Amino acid sequence: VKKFPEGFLWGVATASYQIEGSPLADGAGMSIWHTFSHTPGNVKNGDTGDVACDHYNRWKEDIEIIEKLGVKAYRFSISWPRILPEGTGRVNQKGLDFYNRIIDTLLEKGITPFVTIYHWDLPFALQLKGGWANREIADWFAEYSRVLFENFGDRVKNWITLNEPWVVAIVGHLYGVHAPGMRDIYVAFRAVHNLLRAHARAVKVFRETVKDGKIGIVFNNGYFEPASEKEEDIRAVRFMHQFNNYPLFLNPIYRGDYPELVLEFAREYLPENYKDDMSEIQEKIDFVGLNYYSGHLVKFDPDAPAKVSFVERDLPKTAMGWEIVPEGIYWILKKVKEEYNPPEVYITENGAAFDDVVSEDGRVHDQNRIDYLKAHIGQAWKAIQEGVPLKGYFVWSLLDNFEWAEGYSKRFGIVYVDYSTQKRIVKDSGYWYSNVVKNNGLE
Amino acid sequence: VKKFPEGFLWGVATASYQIEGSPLADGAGMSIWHTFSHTPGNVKNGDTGDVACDHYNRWKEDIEIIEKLGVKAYRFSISWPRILPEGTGRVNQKGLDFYNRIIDTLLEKGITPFVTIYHWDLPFALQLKGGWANREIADWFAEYSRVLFENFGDRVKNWITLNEPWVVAIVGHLYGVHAPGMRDIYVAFRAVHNLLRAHARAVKVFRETVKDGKIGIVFNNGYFEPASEKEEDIRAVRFMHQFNNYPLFLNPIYRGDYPELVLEFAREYLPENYKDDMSEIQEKIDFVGLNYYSGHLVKFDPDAPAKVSFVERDLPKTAMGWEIVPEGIYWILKKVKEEYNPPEVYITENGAAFDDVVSEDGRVHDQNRIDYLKAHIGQAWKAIQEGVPLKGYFVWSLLDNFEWAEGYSKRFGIVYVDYSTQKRIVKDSGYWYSNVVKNNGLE
Ligand SMILES: CCCCCCCC/N=C1\OC[C@@H]2[C@@H](O)[C@H](O)[C@@H](O)[C@H](O)N12
Numbered sequence: 090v091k092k093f094p095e096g097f098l099w100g101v102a103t104a105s106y107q108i109e110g111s112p113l114a115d116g117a118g119m120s121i122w123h124t125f126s127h128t129p130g131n132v133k134n135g136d137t138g139d140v141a142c143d144h145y146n147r148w149k150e151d152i153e154i155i156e157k158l159g160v161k162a163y164r165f166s167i168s169w170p171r172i173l174p175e176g177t178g179r180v181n182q183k184g185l186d187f188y189n190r191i192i193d194t195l196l197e198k199g200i201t202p203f204v205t206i207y208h209w210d211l212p213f214a215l216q217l218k219g220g221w222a223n224r225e226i227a228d229w230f231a232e233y234s235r236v237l238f239e240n241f242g243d244r245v246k247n248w249i250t251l252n253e254p255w256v257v258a259i260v261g262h263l264y265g266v267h268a269p270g271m272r273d274i275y276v277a278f279r280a281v282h283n284l285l286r287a288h289a290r291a292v293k294v295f296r297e298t299v300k301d302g303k304i305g306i307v308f309n310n311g312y313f314e315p316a317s318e319k320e321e322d323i324r325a326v327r328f329m330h331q332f333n334n335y336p337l338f339l340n341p342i343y344r345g346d347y348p349e350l351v352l353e354f355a356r357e358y359l360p361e362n363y364k365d366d367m368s369e370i371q372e373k374i375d376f377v378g379l380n381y382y383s384g385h386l387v388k389f390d391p392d393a394p395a396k397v398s399f400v401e402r403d404l405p406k407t408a409m410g411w412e413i414v415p416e417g418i419y420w421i422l423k424k425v426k427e428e429y430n431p432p433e434v435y436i437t438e439n440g441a442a443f444d445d446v447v448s449e450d451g452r453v454h455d456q457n458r459i460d461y462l463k464a465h466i467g468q469a470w471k472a473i474q475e476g477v478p479l480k481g482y483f484v485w486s487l488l489d490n491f492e493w494a495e496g497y498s499k500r501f502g503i504v505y506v507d508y509s510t511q512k513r514i515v516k517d518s519g520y521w522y523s524n525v526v527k528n529n530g531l532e
Numbered sequence: 533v534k535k536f537p538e539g540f541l542w543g544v545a546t547a548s549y550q551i552e553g554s555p556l557a558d559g560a561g562m563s564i565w566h567t568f569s570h571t572p573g574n575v576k577n578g579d580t581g582d583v584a585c586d587h588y589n590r591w592k593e594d595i596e597i598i599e600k601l602g603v604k605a606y607r608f609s610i611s612w613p614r615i616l617p618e619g620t621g622r623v624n625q626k627g628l629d630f631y632n633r634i635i636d637t638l639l640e641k642g643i644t645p646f647v648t649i650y651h652w653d654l655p656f657a658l659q660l661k662g663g664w665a666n667r668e669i670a671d672w673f674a675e676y677s678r679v680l681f682e683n684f685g686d687r688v689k690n691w692i693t694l695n696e697p698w699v700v701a702i703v704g705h706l707y708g709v710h711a712p713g714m715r716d717i718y719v720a721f722r723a724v725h726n727l728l729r730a731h732a733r734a735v736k737v738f739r740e741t742v743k744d745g746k747i748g749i750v751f752n753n754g755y756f757e758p759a760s761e762k763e764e765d766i767r768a769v770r771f772m773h774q775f776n777n778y779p780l781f782l783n784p785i786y787r788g789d790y791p792e793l794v795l796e797f798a799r800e801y802l803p804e805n806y807k808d809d810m811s812e813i814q815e816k817i818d819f820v821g822l823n824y825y826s827g828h829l830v831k832f833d834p835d836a837p838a839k840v841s842f843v844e845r846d847l848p849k850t851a852m853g854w855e856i857v858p859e860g861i862y863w864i865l866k867k868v869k870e871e872y873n874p875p876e877v878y879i880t881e882n883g884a885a886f887d888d889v890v891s892e893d894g895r896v897h898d899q900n901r902i903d904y905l906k907a908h909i910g911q912a913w914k915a916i917q918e919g920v921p922l923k924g925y926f927v928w929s930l931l932d933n934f935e936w937a938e939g940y941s942k943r944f945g946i947v948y949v950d951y952s953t954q955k956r957i958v959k960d961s962g963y964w965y966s967n968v969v970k971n972n973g974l975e
């Protein structure tokens with residue numbers, strides 16, 4: 090029996106573009122994901138978020154599933170261009186109405202909302218002006234955030250500024266695999282920097298506009314291990330942790346500068362005078378959200394960008410090919426405590442894609458996903474016994490949904506969605522997780 | 533023999549980023565090609581324009597080659613961020629000095645400069661604000677052009693606003709193969725439209741500043757032919773001509789709208805009120821420059837984007853794998869006259885990459901390149917006999933140089949450059965072309 094602390098917050102998570110559909114309904118502006126996915130060759134099978142799970146229309150049924158499973162919290166994101174179709178300026182009242190109904194409904198049902206302000210669907214109007222490459226985005230994001238706070242902050246008390254700024258900057262602007270689909274390392278590092286600047290502006294206006302609220306920010310993380318005991322492999326791991334995991338952003342927030350090995354690799358790409366912005370970047374936050382899915386073996390590789398390469402291991406893998414290493418969620422939780430000692434931490438995403446099917450009995454028996462979640466939840470419990478102030482844990486995702494450049498081919502839900510009919514079928518993992526929440530842990 | 537008109541201009545062409553090196557010397561700002569080529573994975577072999585042909589230091593020797601060869605015109609481009617390091621605002625004197633010495637030197641030796649204002653090296657500072665995706669670029673570009681007209685317009689009387697706006701827009705923002713490396717079809721067609729607006733705005737400034745000069749614009753073109761007589765193949769060719777050749781830009785300039793078939797395909801991606809800008813885009817131009825390298829067999833293809841695909845043919849190809857179809861140059865010249873009757877036309881590039889070998893005699897026996905140039909010059913001559921107002925022909929390129937995403941691996945020069953020593957070796961095609969110039973044609 091692994092019982093969690095009293096009041097621990099068990100949650101499920103989604104993001105706007107991945108579930109909503111109806112990107113241009115009710116006068117909403119285009120986002121960069123609408124334009125990126127409508128560009129041939131960017132997304133597997135030419136999939137787009139045009140329909141997705143049709144949560145734009147089916148939101149009430151989806152919330153009723155959260156209630157039925159007795160899940161305590163719901164992390165979801167708001168689509169910036171539904172609110173400000175031009176990025177700034179004119180507020181779209183129908184966009185407020187859509188999210189107001191969701192928020193009111195969650196409260197009515199005793200479900201705690203955690204709002205992600207930005208989960209990647211930048212208004213296309215702002216991309217035309219350079220998007221995350223433009224220092225002015227700190228002002229644009231501050232405006233958008235204030236709008237959300239003044240409208241929703243009387244009811245929503247738990248907020249997240251950015252989902253995975255490393256991904257937004259590096260996958261979006263260096264690899265070009267996510268919107269806006271660019272490949273320029275100087276632009277990517279300026280994005281990393283402007284994301285931090287925008288985050289800090291949002292937190293500053295939050296303190297002015299929301300009463301009794303908490304605000305945080307969410308990082309992707311992997312558990313990197315050395316391919317050997319050679320010192321250069323151990324160093325490769327340190328560089329991968331500093332660059333790919335929370336330190337890239339938490340070293341600035343808590344210490345006022347980038348990590349040492351990131352500066353070693355990337356000082357050239359950062360704005361000259363970037364450090365002038367650090368004092369404002371250190372705006373105090375209430376909690377750190379960590380996402381965690383996978384572990385990676387890494388080695389020094391003299392002929393690789395940043396002199397590091399991944400090494401494939403013979404470990405169990407999900408349908409993404411991602412290695413399942415549950416102790417990594419323990420490691421990242423312990424390590425964030427040791428390195429930055431944030432007052433509170435949440436696992437804001439953990440979960441897995443598997444090739445789910447509906448069996449002849451009409452149920453979706455996804456035992457692989459149960460076993461994945463069970464092992465990670467036990468490891469999170471271990472971190473708590475060792476003093477990590479973990480306040481909550483959110484499964485990615487409530488629903489199978491649009492998995493970015495992989496399209497609909499990768500299913501992460503605890504609820505299956507048949508995209509031909511939009512029927513929801515709660516998976517075994519959903520009923521299993523319902524029991525975890527009921528027992529406040531594993532038995 | 534095929535003698536050209538009296539006063540026919542024989543030239544050679546280069547571009548700033550492809551030959552200069554020293555991208556950051558003397559207060560220059562970064563360009564998007566510096567940051568793109570310094571991003572791993574974007575350019576063959578990790579090649580950059582950091583040194584290139586070192587023309588930044590060797591320009592006098594290179595001009596002396598043009599002089600020794602008897603070539604009468606030199607088309608070269610100016611690096612925008614050498615002149616305005618932040619894209620707008622403060623002018624960099626040393627950048628002006630660099631091009632001034634080039635211009636004075638050409639004029640002392642009786643070589644006519646043709647200046648390309650924009651040959652793809654956008655200031656990086658402007659890319660951070662959206663670059664060609666941002667409407668405001670018409671202003672930025674008009675101001676930059678003004679600075680060049682004011683500083684050099686006393687001496688330079690032949691000007692080109694943009695080199696191959698189709699490539700800038702489509703290859704740089706839809707295929708992501710050139711800087712700034714993006715893949716977004718909405719951004720790409722915004723870029724097309726803003727390039728037209730910037731060009732027209734520059735010509736308007738030109739009329740104010742350089743009263744006795746001529747200005748034009750340069751387009752890429754291929755000679756498209758249908759894979760069969762099926763009607764869908766014939767319509768595919770008409771589409772490829774309207775989209776990939778001069779009509780995309782000349783229909784706006786001469787007729788006040790995009791080509792029919794381009795609108796059919798792309799109205800979604802163009803700004804909704806794009807036609808409001810057409811009157812200004814009609815600003816009168818003095819000449820059209822046409823680039824031409826290859827012919828392509830095309831078919832209707834239901835599975836392809838735009839529903840068109842290229843079909844490989846059994847034809848001689850260059851080391852690029854580009855089909856050698858010299859009658860294509862005749863066709864594009866006849867057709868631009870038939871369709872838009874520009875007052876003056878110039879072939880602003882024609883040339884070929886071959887696997888050049890320096891033999892024991894210290895020479896480069898590129899009969900392949902001679903055969904290519906000769907056939908195209910003969911076809912251009914035929915166009916002239918039939919009434920096309922072709923005023924000059926420029927070989928791409930004077931020098932082997934940095935071939936964009938191909939890096940140094942592809943050599944187009946009539947002069948070989950050994951990059952280890954920066955030694956210049958005139959190729960047999962260079963001696964041959966010198967004779968063409970001396971004879972004013974083919975003998
Ligand atoms: C390097 C190969 C391993 C990549 C594993 C890291 C990707 C795990 N991350 C995600 O896996 C799926 C999930 C996305 O659906 C969610 O929108 C994102 O916030 C988050 O990035 N998500």
Ligand SMILES: CCCCCCCC/N=C1\OC[C@@H]2[C@@H](O)[C@H](O)[C@@H](O)[C@H](O)N12
Binds near residue numbers: 696823854928935
């Ligand atoms: C599928 C298309 C195959 C044919 C592509 C033909 C490309 C021909 N164009 C060029 O070939 C080389 C030359 C560039 O060096 C020059 O800077 C550009 O202005 C110009 O675009 N250049």
